[PDB]
């Protein structure tokens, strides 16, 4: 089966964890700014076919009112099933440059629902320190696997030449946020992304 | 005599129009966002020495007061003499996109003076049309040549591979307002150069 090419990235269309995870989401972080156009990363969003049949309460609902529809969002984010995040680099930076986004908008939403505690606080530096000895060079891939069975989340840094590395992270808030600055609506870090697996999910949820 | 390294970019210390000219300052235009630096050019700003002559009401005084004074910078641009700017490109751009940023920078400037008239309309077309038909590989020149005989510009696009390609602008409105942003103080392009400007020129202004 043939890749799909998420601004000339290639991503597999499928991908297996626990069960198999369709591709239904895919699109880029930039930024437009003095008429040009800076491309960061690609992303590719995975999930269960059948989630469809948890995000039944929006069904008839169109793509352009799914991507407005936050508690739409809401609902896919905790959605039961596994999920998996693909991101593609495109603009080479460091490590600590993408830990430092993380962090800042993990701890932002933490903060916002006053859940920035201990256990958030260590999970989020053990994190931090993960990316912060990498260097993202282009086409190095960020994988974040989200199992059914458990509020965790298990990252890999992949690049050519070096071996995979890896980190779980253990607190269930450090990884709702993190599902949140990819998934969450109208506050997505990717608009694009969101566009399309709302209009993907308004598809498969009419019929 | 040695080149002087502005961000890793050779610049002559002195170039010669119709008269020796001092480079009095240097910086670059960058965007800081998502805890990351973008650099698109790096500039060079080259005056006459007597130019300080000129400044004289703004003696004794220093350099972060001088990078805050638009009424400092306002006598800077339209004191007598030859003027020279030199930006070599960083970030690889279609003409196009400088052309835009520089017709945006202008137009605004000529509308808030209510300038924006037939004359300045088709003179920035012009330079509109000179920037569209090239592309800005990585070390590609710009330079903007205001001599002290004319309200004029003489600008020079150079590429390796490439012959010169040169426009002349008559209109003093649009020359004056490409003169404004660079070299505007506060509303400056590039606050590194102006900082940088103010600076070497409060330390002249102090002999």
């Given at each position: 089966?043939e ?10 269309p499928?991908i ?9 989401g895919?699109?880029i972080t930039?930024?437009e700014?003095?008429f ?11 999930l269960?076919?059948e989630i469809?049949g948890h995000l039944?309460?929006?069904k008839?609902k169109?793509?352009?009112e799914?991507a407005?529809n936050?508690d739409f969002?809401e ?6 099933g596994?999920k998996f995040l ?8 460091k490590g600590?440059?993408?830990?430092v986004?993380?962090?800042?908008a993990v701890?932002?939403?933490?903060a ?9 606080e260590e999970?989020?530096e ?10 993202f ?8 696997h989200f199992?059914?069975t ?10 050519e030449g070096?071996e995979?590395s890896?980190?779980?992270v253990?607190?269930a ?12 609506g109208t ?5 694009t ?6 209009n ?7 019929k």
């Amino acid at each position: 089966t043939e890749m799909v090419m998420v601004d000339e990235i290639p991503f597999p269309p499928q991908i297996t964890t626990a069960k198999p995870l369709c591709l239904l989401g895919y699109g880029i972080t930039d930024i437009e700014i003095h008429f040009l156009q800076i491309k960061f990363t690609a992303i590719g969003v995975y999930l269960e076919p059948e989630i469809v049949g948890h995000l039944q309460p929006w069904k008839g609902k169109s793509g352009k009112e799914l991507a407005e529809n936050d508690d739409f969002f809401e609902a896919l984010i905790s959605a039961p099933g596994e999920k998996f995040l693909r991101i593609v680099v495109i603009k080479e930076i460091k490590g600590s440059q993408y830990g430092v986004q993380l962090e800042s908008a993990v701890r932002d939403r933490l903060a916002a629902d006053d859940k920035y505690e201990e256990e958030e606080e260590e999970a989020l530096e053990k994190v931090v320190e993960f990316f912060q000895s990498k260097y993202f060079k282009k086409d190095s891939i960020i994988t974040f696997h989200f199992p059914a069975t458990s509020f965790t989340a298990e990252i890999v840094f992949a690049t050519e030449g070096k071996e995979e590395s890896k980190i779980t992270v253990e607190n269930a808030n450090v990884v709702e946020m993190i599902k949140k600055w990819y998934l969450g609506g109208t506050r997505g870090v990717s608009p694009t992304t969101i566009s399309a697996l709302a209009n993907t999910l308004a598809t498969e949820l009419s019929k």
